[PDB]
Amino acid sequence: APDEITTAWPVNVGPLNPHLYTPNQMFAQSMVYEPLVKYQADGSVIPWLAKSWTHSEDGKTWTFTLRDDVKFSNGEPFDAEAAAENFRAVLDNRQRHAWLELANQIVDVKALSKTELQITLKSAYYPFLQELALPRPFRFIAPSQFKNHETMNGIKAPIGTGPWILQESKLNQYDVFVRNENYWGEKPAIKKITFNVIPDPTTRAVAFETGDIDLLYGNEGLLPLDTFARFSQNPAYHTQLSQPIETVMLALNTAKAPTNELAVREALNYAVNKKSLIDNALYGTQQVADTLFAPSVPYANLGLKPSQYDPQKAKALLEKAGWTLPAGKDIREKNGQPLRIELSFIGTDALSKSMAEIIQADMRQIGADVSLIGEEESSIYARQRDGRFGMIFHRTWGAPYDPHAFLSSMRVPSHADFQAQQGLADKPLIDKEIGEVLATHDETQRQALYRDILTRLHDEAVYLPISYISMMVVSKPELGNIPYAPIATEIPFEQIKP
Ligand SMILES: O=C(O)CN(CCN(CC(=O)O)Cc1ccccc1O)Cc1ccccc1
Ligand SMILES: [Cl-]
Ligand SMILES: [Cl-]
Ligand SMILES: [Fe+3]
């Protein structure tokens, strides 16, 4: 079975509704469904299902010329009518897509002919093409598979145009994909991919050592990092670690005592020994982060000043703000109140817990009492949406989302970043500038607005950046070098070539 592989994922791929979110998995939606335009590593898009496009002078009306040779995997044609019908299906559920500003920008979509698709926007939104390139929601399912002329209430078969077809799924067991033998583009070398559902990282590593699976591919949570390092020395296996793809950080609640105080947030940003954290909890496998976005992120090379590990300075900042230590005690107090902060995280995530214990210890050394609140996922998501946290673990979203889409979403009240920022006097100005930057085509003004937003978020110490994390791979050697997709959340199975 040289052209069949077995891999794993912590959950099933879901129903593969192209227009909905969890329990659908972004990498599996991208295996079956395709965009008008495809994201590239240099930050551009190339023609995909749209072979070319034009736009009006005011940048609000766009017209795409679609390929005329593409079929859905069930034989039905892909054309401008089918594409228009998918946009209607997505936007009939608009409210759900509020995080993604293109969904509020699209005013009209219509098929002018079988090959001409016209999209009209509210404003000259600059990230238009990059948001059409995302895994969801602007993909394409055969309209025959709508339920009652819609997708927001479910689909029939998950029929896309892409290079893989879902063969079958068994909840809590496995998902099987096969190559689309009528694909309009390049045939994948691999014919069949089985996903074993294996939620625990330790069990994933055991499945690979026993040879039950051929490939693990994921972020820093993929398997235990000590095990990963050991596998990278084991000549029977192959391992890889990409260049960093996004940031992991704490979000600090500027609207909740005592993180509502700038001096407290500044002191916390000097309290953590990040290098030690990464060598201790992560096994030396990741990068230290000093700012929300790494300097290599577009529009984020700003010369922002790092807060290096400096307990002396953290203590001095707290002392100056009136948080001093009472005879007998190791925890500071101001106005009778102890310097106590709750750090919420997913209680069953061993790596998260690991990091939280380190953060609690480092902060105790400067006289902050961090209480760890480890809870199930739904509970932590609820806290993020509603600002019920002191500090929370968080992360950015990688290319092509960083920085524009991650910033865009800071305006949405049901997101952790809005909630963390809600206490800032300049929050309204930041949100107004985020709206401006997304529609600004004066390149000078666009860079100025990104520098201002990112600078204010850095100076206000809203985040405690921890690490810039990478994608990791463990594979049987016979699979060869495993590529990495331009979009951080996709897996390029079509590029694997034993
Ligand atoms: O991740 C979130 O904060 C929420 N999601 C929206 C934003 N995410 C992109 C995506 O999921 O397609 C960001 C995102 C980017 C990169 C990897 C994973 C991601 O989840 C899901 C959701 C949508 C509507 C209402 C509630 C939740
Ligand atoms: Cl999920
Ligand atoms: Cl402009
Ligand atoms: Fe999401």
Curated annotation (Swiss-Prot):
Keyword Lipoprotein attributed: no
Entry-linked Pfam families: SBP_bac_5
GO MF, any single term: transition metal ion binding
SUPFAM superfamilies, sorted: Periplasmic binding protein-like II
BP term (GO), one: negative chemotaxis
Alphabetical list of PROSITE patterns matching this protein: SBP_BACTERIAL_5
Keyword match Cell membrane: no
Protein location: Periplasm
Coiled-coil segments on the chain, per record: none
Record keywords: Nickel, Periplasm, Signal, Transport
Record CDD domains: PBP2_NikA (cd08489)
PANTHER family documented for this protein: NICKEL-BINDING PERIPLASMIC PROTEIN, PERIPLASMIC BINDING COMPONENT OF ABC TRANSPORTER
Annotated protein name in UniProt: Nickel-binding periplasmic protein
Gene giving rise to this polypeptide: nikA
